[PDB]
């Protein structure tokens, strides 16, 4: 259809909505669009960046001399975070420059000015140079979450790692200093890493991260056991206390059809339910619920197979099942042989498909959720570029009331869902190097 749209010069990774402007994180570019019609206002060129042995990140290398180039590299945006607390500012983190972050500050009376004030977040670490706190993001795959606690900003990161010694962390928390120059790991318990032994053998994909019920939750796809080839979905959950990661416990998230096991999480979304769904699942109108789109695996692989499910987990039931003691210590942190021990739960938490096998012949690669009266609706994307909206209800699946090819490229899991006054608003949906505005109610 004729829906508001913008095609980019380069593929789009991340997106954030702030002060009536859409900010696209794309290869070598941050684009700034108009909320109304997706009209391009301003663009920032982030790459391609020259990697040189004599250059250090966030120092003005122009000034050195006639620099004979090392490698030119494409600056893929790995993360895009809005801070409102220290400044009115946008923090972007690139694949290039050691996974360093840069922050764009907004002039008071001009929202769209990403080029005016741009500070680079890096401070030379001399005592222990191998330990870089300002090196945030992995070019393989990275998930950034930005909490505000006790008038100080924390960054919970989840980096995918294969062996490249030089020095990032699998799961970590770092505090952005009040001077805003750099980050700092407070304790040695502020991070958890995969052992040098299993960096390549045991890879971890960080699907989604979110704060809820005074906890931090990370969703992840990894091997079921260090030895085993069969792949797995897990819900990591740790406490935020003492400026460290405490009470860290991975446990398996399962989605079954009735056993067909949809064992790989493709995308996820945390939201409130509609009165109809709330009643059905034993939940309340204010309760956070993790909506998660799963997929069946090719055997001995993490690759999906064009067979999707979708199942809901109210975090309050996730936490209850978590507080139930059976157990092993975390296989990948130690060797194989809220309050000090890093844990791996044996038994999977499982849930019945909420569509009851309605999508067994398609690959779902995206999910949003919004509420219309008593009904909960879900904005599904697909690998074929097929969008669709469908009512959610455990008691009887339903034909998608909207459904059409938005593009040929897969629908990205990176999504926005805004509300205008009157409860009706829109969804922003990415397909390759194209973003489109779709309304919620038809």
């Amino acid at each position, epitope marked *: 259809y004729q829906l508001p749209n913008f095609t980019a010069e380069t593929p789009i990774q991340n997106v954030i909505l702030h002060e009536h402007h859409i900010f696209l994180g794309a290869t070598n570019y941050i684009y700034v669009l108009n909320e109304e019609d997706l009209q391009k206002v301003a663009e920032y060129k982030t790459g391609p960046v020259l990697e040189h042995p004599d250059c250090f990140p966030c120092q003005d290398c122009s*000034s*050195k001399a006639n620099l004979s180039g090392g490698v030119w590299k494409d600056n893929i945006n790995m993360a895009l975070v809005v801070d409102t607390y220290y400044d009115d500012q946008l923090i972007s983190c690139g694949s290039v420059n050691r996974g360093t972050c840069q922050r764009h500050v907004f002039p008071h009376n001009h929202t769209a000015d990403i080029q005016s004030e741009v500070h680079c977040i*890096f*401070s*030379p*670490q*001399i005592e222990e*140079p191998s330990q870089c706190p300002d090196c945030v993001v992995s070019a393989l795959g990275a998930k950034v979450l930005s909490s505000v606690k006790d008038r100080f900003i924390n960054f919970f990161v989840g980096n995918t790692i294969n062996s490249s010694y030089f020095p990032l962390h699998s799961i970590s928390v770092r505090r952005l200093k009040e*001077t805003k*120059d750099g980050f700092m790991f407070l304790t040695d318990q502020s991070y958890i890493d995969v052992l040098p032994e299993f960096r390549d053998s045991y890879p971890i994909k960080y699907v989604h991260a979110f704060e809820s019920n005074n906890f931090i939750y990370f969703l992840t796809v990894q091997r079921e056991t260090l030895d085993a080839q069969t792949f797995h979905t897990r819900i990591i959950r740790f406490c935020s206390i003492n400026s460290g990661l405490h009470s860290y416990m991975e446990m398996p998230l399962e989605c079954i059809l009735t056993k067909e096991v949809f064992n790989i999480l493709q995308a996820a979304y945390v939201s409130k339910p509609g009165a109809q769904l709330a009643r059905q699942i034993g939940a309340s109108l204010n309760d956070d619920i993790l909506f998660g789109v799963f997929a069946q695996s090719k055997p001995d692989s993490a690759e999906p197979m064009d067979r999707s499910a979708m199942c809901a987990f109210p975090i309050k039931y996730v936490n209850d099942f978590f507080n139930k003691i059976n157990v092993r210590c975390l296989q990948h942190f130690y060797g194989p042989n809220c309050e000090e021990y890093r844990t791996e739960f044996t038994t999977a938490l499982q849930r019945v498909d909420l569509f009851m096998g309605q999508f067994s012949e398609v690959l779902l690669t995206s999910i949003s959720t919004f509420i219309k009266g008593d009904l909960t609706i879900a904005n599904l994307g697909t690998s074929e570029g097929r969008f669709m909206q469908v009512v959610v209800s455990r008691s009887g699946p339903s034909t998608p009331h909207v459904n059409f090819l938005l593009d040929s490229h897969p629908v990205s899991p990176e999504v926005i869902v805004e509300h205008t006054l009157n409860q009706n608003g829109y969804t922003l949906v990415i397909t390759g190097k194209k973003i489109t505005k779709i309304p919620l109610n038809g």
Partner: antibody, heavy 118, light 108 residues
Framework: QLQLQESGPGLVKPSETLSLTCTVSGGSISSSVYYWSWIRQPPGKGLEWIGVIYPSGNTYYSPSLKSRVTISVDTSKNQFSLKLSSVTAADTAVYYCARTIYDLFDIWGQGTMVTVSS | DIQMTQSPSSVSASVGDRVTITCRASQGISSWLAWYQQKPGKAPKLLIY???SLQSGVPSRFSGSGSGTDFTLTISSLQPEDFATYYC?????????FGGGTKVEIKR
């Protein structure tokens, strides 16, 4: 903790070229992490930077001096050296060799007095 | 090329005092700053790097802060050994540039 010690002529004529050498001990000159640079201090004045050599082997010099300065490394003698040329009364200063990590100086030699005089 | 203006150039303060030195830059250094202490006829000794990271061997009574253009170094409780000339160095952009210097004397 490695140590640095400068060496070379106390006295050098005007127009002649100056040669110094900083000899490293308790650590290799060849490292991926730390690298070498020269700094001087004119008598009763502030510090002023001369040049660096990175582990790449690339050399950068202060624009004040670029025409005359040459810094080099000798992996076999665990040494690096400075050759300043067309030397003038203005170059009379204490020459400090310096270990360098992320373009900041962490370890320093005692320094050598070099006096330019006929 | 990047002017580093230090102040004051001289200072005198009693043992126990909190003496405080300021470095000001002509450009955005961000964090690429170190603070050096030079005893007379000696090599400069690194105290602070990255504007506010205290060096390994250094007394806690030293500390600095700042970002962008304006940085300061504070000796919280002055000592007779803390007699020296103090320097700020910039390394955000070449050539690296040192400040004028601050001489610190003890009152007695």
């Amino acid at each position: 903790q490695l140590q640095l010690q400068e060496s070379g002529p106390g006295l050098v004529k005007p127009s002649e070229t100056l040669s110094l050498t900083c000899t490293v001990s308790g650590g290799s000159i060849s490292s991926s992490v730390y690298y070498w640079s020269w700094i001087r201090q004119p008598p009763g004045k502030g510090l002023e930077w001369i040049g660096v050599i990175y582990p790449s082997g690339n050399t950068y010099y202060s624009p004040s001096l670029k025409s005359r300065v040459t810094i080099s490394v000798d992996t076999s003698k665990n040494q690096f050296s400075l050759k300043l040329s067309s030397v003038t009364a203005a170059d009379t200063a204490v020459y400090y060799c310096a270990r360098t990590i992320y373009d900041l100086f962490d370890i320093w030699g005692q320094g050598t007095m070099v006096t330019v005089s006929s | 090329d990047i002017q580093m203006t230090q102040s004051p150039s001289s200072v005198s303060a009693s043992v126990g005092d909190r003496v405080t030195i300021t470095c000001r830059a002509s450009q955005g250094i961000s964090s690429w700053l170190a603070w050096y202490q030079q005893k007379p006829g000696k090599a400069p000794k690194l105290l602070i790097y990255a504007a506010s990271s205290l060096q390994s061997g250094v007394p806690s009574r030293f500390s600095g802060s700042g970002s962008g253009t304006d940085f300061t170094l504070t000796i919280s409780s002055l000592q007779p050994e803390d007699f020296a000339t103090y320097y700020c160095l910039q390394a955000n952009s070449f050539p690296p540039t040192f400040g004028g210097g601050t001489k610190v004397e003890i009152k007695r």
